[PDB]
Amino acid sequence: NSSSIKVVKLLVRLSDSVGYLFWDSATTGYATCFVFKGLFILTCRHVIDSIVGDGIEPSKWATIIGQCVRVTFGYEELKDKETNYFFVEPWFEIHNEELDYAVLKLKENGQQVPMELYNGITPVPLSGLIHIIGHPYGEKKQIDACAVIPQGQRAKKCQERVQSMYTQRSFQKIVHNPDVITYDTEFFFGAAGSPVFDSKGSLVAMHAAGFAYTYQNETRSIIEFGSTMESILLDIKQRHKPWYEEVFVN
Amino acid sequence: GHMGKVTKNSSSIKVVKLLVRLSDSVGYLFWDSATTGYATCFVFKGLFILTCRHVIDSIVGDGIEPSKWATIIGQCVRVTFGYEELKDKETNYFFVEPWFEIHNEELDYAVLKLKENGQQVPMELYNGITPVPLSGLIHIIGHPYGEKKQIDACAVIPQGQRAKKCQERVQSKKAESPEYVHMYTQRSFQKIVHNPDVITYDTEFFFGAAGSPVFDSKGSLVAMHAAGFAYTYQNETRSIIEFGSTMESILLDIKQRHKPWYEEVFVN
């Protein structure tokens, strides 16, 4: 579970591109995001669901996002929670519900936009150590070193953890899913959109959600998963090819 | 790990940035004497660095006259602060002055002095006296197994549980098979069971990390990692519990036994 000083020195520099996204309009909430490419940031899709609310026509979604969403990258202490924030352009076009990702665009306000975290496609580790950087529980920015659950063991672990709410009939969407990476982390609450890097510090996935339960007045989670950057970028290449060529190759 | 009773392993970005700043003051100490070996040290105060006493025992050797120890140290010990990759293992190193006067066997600490050879002396890690945490999370920075510099976030074992937890692991692994064995004396384990001068924790730096600085959850130097209680099972070597001498005890011992040097170094 220990890491080398070199990798952690890389990770703390990368953490400046991990942001806290918050909104306070008709709905109130938070999430984690990160600078994907250029002025574009990446987060989860159910985050946008929380931002807009139920029963709203899609034609209005962008207008809502550009009116109430703020993103700050310097949230390391309580005082910095809702200060020095970028606005978001009223634009919402690149997303997918299955892979659970959403692309937003920051609005330049004369500040320094953090370095992009997408350096290229990095293969997903089948085992070993990973590092998740985000804002769990809406708290200050934190980093966690986590153990990866190999896909072939996903069906086992779950059934153990239930026998040691839900059923094994409910994990059917992640047990044999090669587009997600499973792991045991403490960032299982409100850390949607937190980047997940491999043991060398390369962006490999984005944390999605978990499965919460209560035990001795404390909220725990059975298993956590995230959408792999390979899957997200391939879906973007296929569904939004003009935007992909406009942003990524030039 | 969220299946049993677990302490939070994660840290905040602010504390981790502080710790990567402090790691530049953690040094890999290697020696080529009658025996060849390695350990960890850290810049204590000014040019002085702190490591473990049994490290000096391993450097000098058995039976050597004490009057020679210093002269051996300042001739064979080298310390590098940039061992973050394999290529930097024994590059850009300081020598140590032929000086060995401040040490203690019971608390297992030893003070050495770097020799300014043109290299950059790191920042000292001793700012003030920090109370020892009774529980929670700590961070160890060092060179375990002689590898590149690493940092581990570990769970503190409260003092009152030292007698409990340990046995719970012993009887857990010992009941299985008759090939289990401890590699430590019980007389050596009973010296930390009710000892407030050491802090105990569960870490992965139970090898070659002697002298590694141990910081609290906020990033303040609180202890120096000493040793562990190793046990082998199925030909794999684990450790029941690890411990470190608190900086409180070390500084008190320095004030009591070496008052002139303490006033010469710390107050003036």
Residue numbers in the entry:
A (entry chain A): 340 to 503, 514 to 599
B (entry chain D): 332 to 599
Sentences from the study reporting this entry:
FAM111A (FAM111 trypsin-like peptidase A) is a serine protease involved in multiple cellular processes including antiviral defense and DNA replication. FAM111A contains a serine protease domain (SPD) with a conserved catalytic triad (His385, Asp439, and Ser541). The FAM111A SPD belongs to the S1 family of serine peptidases, which includes chymotrypsin, in the MEROPS database. Here, we show that FAM111A is a dimerization-dependent protease containing a narrow, recessed active site that cleaves substrates with a chymotrypsin-like specificity.
To mitigate the potential problem with protein production due to autocleavage, we generated the mutant SPD (S541A), which lacks the serine nucleophile of the catalytic triad, and performed crystallization trials with the purified protein. Our crystal structure of the SPD has revealed that it is a dimer with a coiled coil interface between the N-terminal α-helices within the SPDs. Overall, the individual SPD chains are similar to each other, with root mean square derivations (RMSDs) ranging from 0.15 Å to 0.3 Å over Cα atoms. Thus, we focused our analysis on chain D, which is the most complete, but our analysis is broadly applicable to all chains. Interestingly, a protrusion of β-strands (β2 and β10) buttressed by helices α2 and α5 yields a protease domain with an active site located at the bottom of a trench, whereas the active site of chymotrypsin is shallow and accessible for substrate engagement. This suggests that the FAM111A SPD active site architecture is tailored to cleave smaller substrates, such as linker regions or disordered substrates, and not globular proteins. FAM111A possesses an oxyanion hole formed by the backbone amide nitrogen of Ser541 and Gly539, as well as a P1 residue binding pocket (designated as the S1 pocket) similar to that of chymotrypsin. While the S1 pocket in FAM111A is about 0.5 Å narrower than that observed in chymotrypsin, it can still easily accommodate phenylalanine by allowing rotation of the peptide bond between Phe537 and Phe538. The loop L4, which is disordered in the monomeric SPD, is structured in the dimeric SPD and forms salt bridges with Lys348 and Lys345 of the dimerization partner through Glu415 and Glu416. Furthermore, the loop L4 contains Tyr414, which is positioned in the dimer structure adjacent to the loop L6 that is also unstructured in the monomeric SPD but structured in the dimeric SPD.
